[PDB]
Design a protein around this ligand. Structure first.
Ligand SMILES: CCCCCCCCCCCCCCCCCC(=O)O[C@@H](COC(=O)CCCCCCCCCCCCCCC)COP(=O)(O)OC[C@H](O)CO
Ligand SMILES: CCCCCCCCCCCCCCCC(=O)OC[C@H](COP(=O)(O)OCCN)OC(=O)CCCCCCCCCCCCCCC
Lengths: 51, 431
C-alpha cells in the first residue's frame, strides 16, 4: 500500500531538521531587528496654551 | 605672524599680527559643557551672562573695551577686546574680575535678573531656532548618559535648581591654574609675554581639575520631536568622528568638504558641486546642506543636516545622501579630490584669516589647550596637500562602511523611516 516508507521517513527527518533550524533562525532574527521598535519610549509634554 | 609659548604655573600664548589694530587679551578655560552633571546644566551659561550683564557698564565707563564670551563644549572663554595701546587696562580689569573679587558680582538682585534673562533667552531659543535644536538633540542622543551630550545652554528645568552654591562650586572646581591659558591675539609683541607671568598676577586657587569617570561613548539612538504646527522638517544624521590630535582630522575634514553645502534659492549654488546636487535638482527635495565634521577632546561627530519644505520627499533625500556616502568609499575620481582639497584650503584660509581678533583668540586657545602649540597655517596647507585618494578611501572604509549612526528631527516627520531602513542603506546595496 505504501512502498516508500523508508524514503518518506528519511526525507521527512531531513525536512523537519532543516525547517526546525530555519524556524529558530527566524525567531532570533525577528527578535533581533524588532528590538529597536519594541523598546522605544514615548514622553508627553503638554504644549504651551496658545493656539 | 608667529606663535610663542612659555609656562610658569599657567600657560601664556600669543600670535602677534601687526596688520590688524584691535588687540584682544583674555583667558580660556578647558572646562565647559563637558564638565557638568545633568542636574547642573546651565551653570556655565549663568557665568557667561553674569559677566556680560552688569560690569559691561563699568568697562565702557572707566575705560573703553568690548568683552565677549563663548562656550562650545569645554572652552569657556572670556575675551576682552581693546585698542592696541590699552591692553594693560584690559588685563587689570580681567584680574579685578576673576581673581579678586567676585563677591560683589554675586548678589541676589543681579543673579535674579540674570536668571530671568537666561530663562527668557533659553525659552526663545527652544521656541524658534529649529536647526540648532536638532543639532543639540543629535548631541544629546548620540552620547546618552555621558558628560558630552547635555546642551550648552541648559535644560529648562535645570536652571531653577541652583542659585549661589552651585555657581561658586563650579568656580572653585574648574577655574583653576591647570587648564587656563592667556591668549594675546592682536598687535601686541611682548607685553603679554611678560605681564601675564608675575609674582601674584595670576589666577588663585592652585589645584587640579576633577577627573571624569566616563570618557565618551557613541550608540545609535534615534530621537524625534514630531509636531505638525511647524511648516518645515529639519533632520540631521551623524557618525562617529575623531578627537583633536589624531592623524585623521584633516582627512575627515576633506571628506566633509567633498560634498560641501548647497542652497536651492541661490543662482550660484545650483550649478556647482558633486553628483548628489545634480540628482537632487531634478525634483525640488531639499533647501539647505551642512556637511559638518565636528571634533572634541574626547570624540567627534562627522554628519549631515538639511531642511525641506517638501515633506513627502524626505525618504528620497536621505536615500540619495546615504547612497552618495556609500559611493564615496569605493570610487572617487582624482578630480573630485583635487577640487575638495582646493575648496578646503580656501575654507580654512577664510576661517583662520578673518580679521576678528576674538575668533583668532578662540581658535588659538582651542588648539593650544590640547596640543601645546598652534599648528601653523603653512604646515596645515602642506599636510592638506599630502592627502591623496588612498588616504581618504581608507578613512571612509574605516569610519563609514556599515557604522552605527544617530538621527534627529523635528517638525513634519511623518514620512521618515525610523531606524532600520536608514541604517540598512549603507551595506545592502551591491558593492
Ligand atoms: C508576504 C509578502 C511578500 C510575499 C513575497 C513577495 C514577492 C515579491 C518580492 C518583491 C521584492 C521584495 C524582495 C526583497 C526586496 C529588498 C528591498 C529592495 O530591493 O528594495 C529597496 C531598494 O533598494 C535600492 O533601491 C538599492 C538596492 C538595489 C541596488 C542593487 C541591485 C543588485 C541586484 C538586484 C537584482 C534583482 C533586481 C530586481 C529587484 C526587484 C528599498 O530599500 P532602500 O535601500 O531603497 O531603502 C529605503 C530608502 O529610504 C529609500 O530608497
Ligand atoms: C524570495 C525570498 C522569500 C521572500 C522574501 C523574504 C525576505 C528576503 C530578504 C528581504 C530583506 C531584504 O532583502 O533586505 C534586508 C537585508 C539586510 O541586509 P543589511 O541591511 O543587514 O546589510 C547587510 C547585507 N549587505 O538585505 C538583503 O538581504 C538584500 C537582498 C536583496 C535581494 C534582492 C532580490 C534577489 C533576487 C534573487 C534572484 C535574482 C534573479
Amino acid at each position: 500500500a505504501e512502498p516508500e516508507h523508508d524514503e518518506r521517513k528519511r526525507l521527512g527527518l531531513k525536512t523537519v531538521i532543516i525547517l526546525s533550524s530555519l524556524y529558530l533562525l527566524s525567531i532570533w532574527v525577528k527578535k533581533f531587528k524588532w528590538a529597536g521598535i519594541k523598546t522605544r519610549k514615548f514622553v508627553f509634554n503638554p504644549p504651551k496654551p496658545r493656539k | 605672524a608667529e606663535v610663542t609659548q612659555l609656562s610658569n604655573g599657567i600657560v601664556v600664548a600669543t600670535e602677534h599680527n601687526p596688520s590688524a589694530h584691535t588687540a584682544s587679551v583674555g583667558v580660556v578655560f578647558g572646562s565647559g559643557a563637558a564638565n557638568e552633571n545633568p542636574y547642573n546644566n546651565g551653570v556655565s551659561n549663568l557665568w557667561k551672562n553674569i559677566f556680560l550683564s552688569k560690569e559691561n557698564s563699568a568697562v565702557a565707563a572707566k575705560e573703553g573695551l568690548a568683552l565677549s564670551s563663548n562656550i562650545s563644549r569645554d572652552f569657556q572663554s572670556y575675551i576682552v577686546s581693546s585698542l592696541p595701546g590699552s591692553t594693560d587696562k584690559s588685563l587689570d580689569f580681567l584680574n579685578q574680575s576673576f581673581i579678586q573679587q567676585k563677591a560683589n558680582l554675586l548678589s541676589s538682585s543681579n543673579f535674579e535678573a540674570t536668571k530671568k534673562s537666561v530663562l527668557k533667552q533659553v525659552q526663545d531659543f527652544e521656541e524658534n531656532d529649529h536647526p540648532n535644536r536638532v543639532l543639540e538633540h543629535l548631541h544629546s542622543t548620540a552620547f546618552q548618559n555621558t558628560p558630552l551630550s547635555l546642551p550648552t545652554r541648559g535644560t529648562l528645568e535645570s536652571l531653577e535648581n541652583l542659585v549661589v552654591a552651585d555657581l561658586e562650586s563650579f568656580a572653585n572646581n574648574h577655574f583653576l591654574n591647570s587648564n587656563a591659558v592667556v591668549v594675546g591675539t592682536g598687535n601686541i609683541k611682548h607685553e603679554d609675554l611678560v605681564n601675564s607671568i608675575e609674582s601674584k598676577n595670576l589666577s588663585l586657587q592652585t589645584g587640579t581639575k576633577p577627573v571624569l569617570k566616563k570618557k565618551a561613548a557613541f550608540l545609535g539612538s534615534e530621537v524625534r520631536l514630531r509636531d505638525d504646527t511647524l511648516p518645515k522638517a529639519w533632520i540631521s544624521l551623524a557618525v562617529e568622528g575623531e578627537p583633536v590630535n589624531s592623524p585623521n582630522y584633516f582627512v575627515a575634514k576633506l571628506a566633509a568638504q567633498i560634498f560641501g553645502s548647497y542652497n536651492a534659492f541661490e543662482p550660484a549654488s545650483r550649478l556647482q558641486g558633486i553628483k548628489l546636487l545634480d540628482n537632487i535638482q531634478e525634483y525640488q527635495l531639499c533647501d539647505n546642506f551642512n556637511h559638518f565634521s565636528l571634533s572634541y577632546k574626547d570624540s567627534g561627530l562627522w554628519g549631515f543636516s538639511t531642511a525641506t519644505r517638501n515633506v513627502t520627499m524626505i525618504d528620497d533625500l536621505i536615500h540619495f545622501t546615504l547612497k552618495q556616502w556609500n559611493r564615496l568609499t569605493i570610487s572617487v575620481t582624482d578630480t573630485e579630490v583635487e577640487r575638495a582639497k582646493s575648496l578646503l584650503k580656501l575654507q580654512l584660509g577664510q576661517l583662520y584669516e578673518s580679521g576678528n581678533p576674538v575668533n583668532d583668540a578662540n581658535l588659538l586657545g582651542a588648539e593650544v589647550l590640547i596640543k601645546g602649540s598652534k599648528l601653523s597655517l603653512g604646515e596645515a596647507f602642506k599636510k592638506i596637500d599630502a592627502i591623496t585618494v588612498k588616504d581618504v578611501k581608507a578613512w571612509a572604509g574605516k569610519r563609514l562602511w556599515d557604522q552605527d549612526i544617530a538621527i534627529a528631527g523635528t517638525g513634519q516627520i511623518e514620512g521618515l523611516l525610523d531606524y532600520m531602513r536608514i541604517r540598512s542603506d549603507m551595506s545592502m546595496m551591491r558593492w
